[PDB]
Amino acid sequence: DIKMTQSPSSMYTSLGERVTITCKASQDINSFLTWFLQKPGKSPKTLIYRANRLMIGVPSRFSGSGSGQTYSLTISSLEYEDMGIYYCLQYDDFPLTFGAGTKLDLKRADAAPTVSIFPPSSEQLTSGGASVVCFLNNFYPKEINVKWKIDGSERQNGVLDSWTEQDSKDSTYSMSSTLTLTKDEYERHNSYTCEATHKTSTSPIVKSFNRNEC
Amino acid sequence: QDQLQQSGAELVRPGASVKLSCKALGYIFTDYEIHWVKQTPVHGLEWIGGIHPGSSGTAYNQKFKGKATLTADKSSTTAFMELSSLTSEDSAVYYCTRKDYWGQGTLVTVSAAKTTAPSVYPLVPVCGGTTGSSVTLGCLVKGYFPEPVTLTWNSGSLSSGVHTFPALLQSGLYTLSSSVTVTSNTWPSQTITCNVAHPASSTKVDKKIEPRV
């Protein structure tokens, strides 16, 4: 098993910029190496093969060099349609092996999330479940931590986290956190709290309510 | 030089079998190896094995030897991949590749789940009802199967300020949520409705967002 070490694993980039992405192999692959790109929910598309051959149809903006162990992909000036994940693939030997991937996003000024908390709905309550929802929306960068506190104590299971992709106009990210409890457990407690940790601040950002109505 | 064309999405029961197909178009089928590749958010991309339709020789990743069978049919220029004894861990996107070209992938979902309509909850702001410039409203669509659900705000009419979060698995069923931010004066003066449709059960739901209390 030949190891492929792709770096970096995520990069914050500007449109117009020149980017370089790399793959080191654990043994000489003799330039048998492809470079491919994957866009959200989309089949991979090869860009380069044999280390430097361009693929019919690929802008001349892409270019790849290397030999031996260290291989490289350069994008001379970045375009909006270039955004996705870049992989590398050695096929010198079996088994074929790939790199972890290199995720590109658009850099922007840092923005703190806008937090919203939602008590269960009456229709939910009337069927035995209680979902407490927290929206952390429009923030940057992607790194965020959420903890749930029921009456002052942290609650780990039943929490469900979902991330949107980088937004095409404003470039921010968004996430929803759903805490599922039963109605009996929900009714046995009073103060439900949302806490968000983000680079934009020291102290986490906290949202709460009280079931007896704050 | 042209394409690889893969079979459709597959929903199978644990312990059953699946035969996927990869149709090769516009190149000499007997001159190139077809390789099959698995993708999943936990493992990344992994190589299952390959087949040379000329010689009929195959090479396998040691991890899939005994699980996966690679065959090819010259007369229909189709490569097939058989997967036996399926489990939730075989749930993934399977690709055939020529190393340069890639088919579009088949989604394989291993599950016991039966088709089930979703439950839709209107998500109104916390009592107190903030007094800022805008308000966020939400809608929570819980417990459906299978995966495809479609969600709009006001039948498509409300489109900006919306966020719709990718569905995730909870206790074997799918859960999804959505959020819209509108200015203070909009709601509750004008109604907002969350419209949800689940084609697999043919469920059509319109839930309005009334103020709490």
Binding site: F32, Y49, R50, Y91, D92, D93, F94 | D31, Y32, E33, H52, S55, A59, R98, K99, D100
Partner: peptide
């Protein structure tokens, strides 16, 4: 693209 292996 390599082919035989």
């Amino acid at each position: 693209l390599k082919g035989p292996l």
